[PDB]
Design a protein around this nucleic acid. Structure first.
Ligand SMILES: [Mg+2]
Length: 224
DNA sequence: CCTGTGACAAATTGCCCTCAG
DNA sequence: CTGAGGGCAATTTGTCACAGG
């Protein structure tokens, strides 16, 4: 119900351009949490196979495989920041490795650390047991945002633009068509989030003439 | 211009089993 | 017994032609 660790990131992260799998995204929640505790710092993070396979209910050998590819797939992966403004960064600067059996040692870009600490009263938070039955990476990105506007009693109301969701979430070009965007993004991520998470969701589109432009996300804690 | 759906390609899921220490 | 490995069938994604508006 609560035993999972609360994550806290700068808004800056939540609104950024990048592609990451379900699995890499799962790792990312874990790194920023070693990061979160330091005091002057550099970004060497540890990844213990045994704990990952407990935290996400996976088998020991299936867990490594997920860690193992996800890491190789960070080569040449970038993230792009904003405000206007525009800046393009590599996640890792040195491949991760294993000095012993069952360990992994990643080397985070230390120019990033500013954007996990950042600056108070302008950030996002959620307990981790919330996110961890999603499988679609994007349905994660939506949940991070919806949380950004969550007010203390657990509900909220927000209107995101369609041009925008595309470019921060870095969805596929095939989805600039709108009926596709119905079938494989929205009809799917509002579903999975609303059955795998303590939150009821609903939306209503906002046309402007012959086009649809904004989605009007509005939600309340499933506790009522 | 807008929409929804049928069908094909390509990528994901968890699952099953080998082998080295 | 743990994890660094190989493989799979079944399901979910990504693409796009077509029909009606
Ligand atoms: Mg897997």
């Amino acid at each position: 119900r609560k035993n999972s660790p609360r994550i806290v990131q700068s808004n800056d992260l939540t609104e950024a351009a990048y592609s990451l799998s379900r699995d890499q995204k799962r790792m990312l929640y874990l790194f920023v949490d070693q990061i979160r505790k330091s005091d002057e710092h550099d970004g060497i993070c540890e990844i213990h196979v045994a704990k990952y396979a407990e935290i996400f209910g996976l088998t020991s050998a299936e867990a490594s495989k997920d860690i193992r590819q996800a890491l190789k797939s960070f080569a040449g992966k970038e993230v792009v920041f904003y405000r206007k403004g525009y800046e393009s960064f590599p996640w890792f600067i040195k491949p991760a490795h294993s000095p012993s059996r069952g360990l992994y040692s990643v080397h985070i870009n230390p120019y990033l650390i500013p954007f996990f600490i950042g600056l108070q009263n302008r950030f996002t938070q959620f307990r981790l047991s919330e996110t961890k039955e999603i499988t679609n990476p994007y349905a994660m990105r939506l949940y991070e945002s919806l949380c950004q506007y969550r007010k203390p009693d657990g509900s909220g109301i927000v209107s995101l633009k369609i041009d925008w969701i595309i470019e921060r979430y870095q969805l596929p070009q095939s989805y600039q068509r709108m009926p596709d965007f119905r079938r494989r993004f929205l009809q799917v991520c509002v579903n999975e989030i609303n059955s795998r998470t303590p939150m009821r969701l609903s939306y209503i589109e906002k046309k402007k003439g012959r086009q649809t432009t904004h989605i009007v996300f509005s939600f309340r804690d499933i506790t009522s």
